[PDB]
Structure 1
Amino acid sequence: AAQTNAPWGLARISSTSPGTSTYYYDESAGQGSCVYVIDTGIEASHPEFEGRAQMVKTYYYSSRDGNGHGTHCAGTVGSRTYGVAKKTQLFGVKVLDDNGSGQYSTIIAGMDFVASDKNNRNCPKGVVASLSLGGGYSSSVNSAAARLQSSGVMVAVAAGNNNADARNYSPASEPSVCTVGASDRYDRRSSFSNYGSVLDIFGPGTDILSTWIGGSTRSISGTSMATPHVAGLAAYLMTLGKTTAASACRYIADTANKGDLSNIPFGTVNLLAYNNYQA
């Protein structure tokens, strides 16, 4: 399949060179896989989700997304126009309030919930969890992310937007998950993106167009935008049978575009997510 005039992030992950505008992908498009979006919620009624998204858990008064952050990330995962895996199933877990904040104890409970909730969902091709959040270092938050990964879920987390080493931020500093940095359309490291040895992969993160609340769209930037690219790619590869939840992060790094990025400090991987699609 080919999506012409696609968002630059989608075209980048289906090309070995920057500057293209077509997203090449296999028609399976992640059908049979499931992706939990642990964020501010999802506006599941948005036409771009085609009825494939639903809220399953909230830790506040409502399950509605009153911020837009979670709706934006979920659209990058699997919306029709702006998504990597255009046929996956989306589940929303609202651990952040409508201001974009949340306590660590609530974020931990959300991860434990996903580990248990997947056992009563029909996801024959596997389960992915996308965490576009984080804060200061916390061993308890790292441990919860390691538990979710150990339970059989491919966990992708944002590296952070501090332009610093991600080793002082959680859950980005947990080695067993997949920590995602951000890049721009010129194959440069995003000026805000964290770095360090704990990073596993880079994804498109600057000026990312996706869905928004009120049935609209808008373009925002952050490592919170790069993570759903990797989460969507994992569901796309797992549906194709290329990898499993336990080894998806390693397979993505093994098959990524290598050396294409600039302004990468020494000690940080120079790897860019890539789907290796050949018609």
Structure 2
Amino acid sequence: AAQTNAPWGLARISSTSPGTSTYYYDESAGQGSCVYVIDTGIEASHPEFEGRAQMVKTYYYSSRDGNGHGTHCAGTVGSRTYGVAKKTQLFGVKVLDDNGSGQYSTIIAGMDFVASDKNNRNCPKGVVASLSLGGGYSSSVNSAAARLQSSGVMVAVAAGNNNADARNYSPASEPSVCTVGASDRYDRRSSFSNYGSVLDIFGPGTDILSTWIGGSTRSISGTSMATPHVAGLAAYLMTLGKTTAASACRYIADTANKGDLSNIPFGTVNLLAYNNYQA
């Protein structure tokens, strides 16, 4: 399948080269997989989701995304225009309030929630979780990411927006999950992407068009916008049969565009997510 005049990041992760605007992908498009967006919530009523998105948990007084962040990230995973994995089932977990603030203990609660809940859902092609959030190093926050990953959920985390080595941030520094930095449409590491040997992969994160609440769209920027490219990609690769939840971060790295970003410090991977679908 081909989707012309696509947001640049979907064209990028289907291409070897920057400067193209068509997104290519096999039409299965993540059918039969499940992605949990653990964030401010998802405006599931957005027609872009077509009935495939459900809130399933909140730790606050409403499960609605009253911020916009969770809805944008979820749209990159799996909205019909703006998504990678256009036939995946989405699930929301509101661990962030509406300003974007969550305590670690509730974040943790969300995470263990997914390791359990997946067993209430039909995900025969595989389970993913997408965490576009974080704060300073915590062993506990990190342990809750290793558990979620160990439980057979592909875990994708934002490396962080401080232009700092990410080993000091959580859940980014955790080893066993897939820590995502960001790039721009000219293949520059993004000016705000954390970096550091704990990264596995880079994805589009500067000027990412996606859904927003009210039924709307906007372009925003972050390792948060890069993260759900890799989560949706992993859903797409599960569904095909290329990899598994426990093997997907390695498979994506093995199949990445290798050498191609500027602005990658010494010691940080120079790997860019790629679906290998057109070449």
What TM-score, normalized by structure 2, do the two folds share?
A: 0.99
Unpaired runs of at least 5, structure 2: none
In the alignment, the residues of structure 2 paired with residue 50 and residue 159 of structure 1 have an alpha-carbon distance, to the nearest angstrom, of 30
Equivalent residues of 2:42, 2:71 under 8 A apart: yes
Unpaired runs of at least 5, structure 1: none
In the alignment, the residues of structure 1 paired with residue 82 and residue 71 of structure 2 have an alpha-carbon distance, to the nearest angstrom, of 12
After TM superposition, the runs of 4+ consecutive aligned structure 1 residues lying more than 4 A away are none
Q: Deviations over 1:31-73 (max 9, x none)?
A: 0000000000000000000000010000000000000000000
- Superposition CA RMSD, Å: 0.6
In the alignment, the residues of structure 2 paired with residue 208 and residue 263 of structure 1 have an alpha-carbon distance, to the nearest angstrom, of 19
Equivalent residues of 2:14, 2:278 under 8 A apart: no
In the alignment, the residues of structure 2 paired with residue 219 and residue 242 of structure 1 have an alpha-carbon distance, to the nearest angstrom, of 31
Report the alpha carbon displacement of residue 123 of structure 1 after superposing the two structures with TM.
0.5
| Equivalent runs, 1:231-250 vs 2, <5 Å | 231-250=231-250
Equivalent residue of 2:214, what SS? Answer: helix
In the alignment, the residues of structure 1 paired with residue 94 and residue 263 of structure 2 have an alpha-carbon distance, to the nearest angstrom, of 35
In the alignment, the residues of structure 1 paired with residue 136 and residue 198 of structure 2 have an alpha-carbon distance, to the nearest angstrom, of 15
Q: Look up the match of 1:216.
A: 216
Report the alpha carbon displacement of residue 278 of structure 1 after superposing the two structures with TM.
3.2
Q: Sequence identity of aligned pairs in percent?
A: 100
Q: Deviations over 1:143-166 (max 9, x none)?
A: 000000000000000000000000
In the alignment, the residues of structure 2 paired with residue 66 and residue 54 of structure 1 have an alpha-carbon distance, to the nearest angstrom, of 15
Report the alpha carbon displacement of residue 120 of structure 1 after superposing the two structures with TM.
1.5
Equivalent residues of 2:29, 2:86 under 8 A apart: yes
In the alignment, the residues of structure 2 paired with residue 86 and residue 239 of structure 1 have an alpha-carbon distance, to the nearest angstrom, of 12
Equivalent residue of 1:56, what SS? Answer: strand
In the alignment, the residues of structure 2 paired with residue 275 and residue 164 of structure 1 have an alpha-carbon distance, to the nearest angstrom, of 28
Q: Deviations over 1:239-261 (max 9, x none)?
A: 00000000100000000000010
In the alignment, the residues of structure 2 paired with residue 256 and residue 33 of structure 1 have an alpha-carbon distance, to the nearest angstrom, of 22
Equivalent residue of 1:113, what SS? Answer: helix
In the alignment, the residues of structure 2 paired with residue 159 and residue 278 of structure 1 have an alpha-carbon distance, to the nearest angstrom, of 28
In the alignment, the residues of structure 2 paired with residue 17 and residue 247 of structure 1 have an alpha-carbon distance, to the nearest angstrom, of 26
In the alignment, the residues of structure 1 paired with residue 260 and residue 80 of structure 2 have an alpha-carbon distance, to the nearest angstrom, of 28
In the alignment, the residues of structure 1 paired with residue 169 and residue 240 of structure 2 have an alpha-carbon distance, to the nearest angstrom, of 33
In the alignment, the residues of structure 1 paired with residue 122 and residue 214 of structure 2 have an alpha-carbon distance, to the nearest angstrom, of 29
Q: Look up the match of 1:112.
A: 112
Report the alpha carbon displacement of residue 131 of structure 1 after superposing the two structures with TM.
0.2
Q: Deviations over 1:72-112 (max 9, x none)?
A: 00000000000000000000000000000010000000000
Equivalent residues of 2:15, 2:278 under 8 A apart: no
Equivalent residues of 2:181, 2:202 under 8 A apart: yes
Equivalent residue of 1:253, what SS? Answer: helix
Q: Look up the match of 1:193.
A: 193
In the alignment, the residues of structure 2 paired with residue 121 and residue 191 of structure 1 have an alpha-carbon distance, to the nearest angstrom, of 38
Q: Look up the match of 1:72.
A: 72
Equivalent residues of 2:44, 2:51 under 8 A apart: yes
In the alignment, the residues of structure 2 paired with residue 84 and residue 123 of structure 1 have an alpha-carbon distance, to the nearest angstrom, of 17
In the alignment, the residues of structure 2 paired with residue 246 and residue 60 of structure 1 have an alpha-carbon distance, to the nearest angstrom, of 31
In the alignment, the residues of structure 2 paired with residue 118 and residue 54 of structure 1 have an alpha-carbon distance, to the nearest angstrom, of 13
In the alignment, the residues of structure 1 paired with residue 65 and residue 111 of structure 2 have an alpha-carbon distance, to the nearest angstrom, of 19
In the alignment, the residues of structure 2 paired with residue 185 and residue 260 of structure 1 have an alpha-carbon distance, to the nearest angstrom, of 12
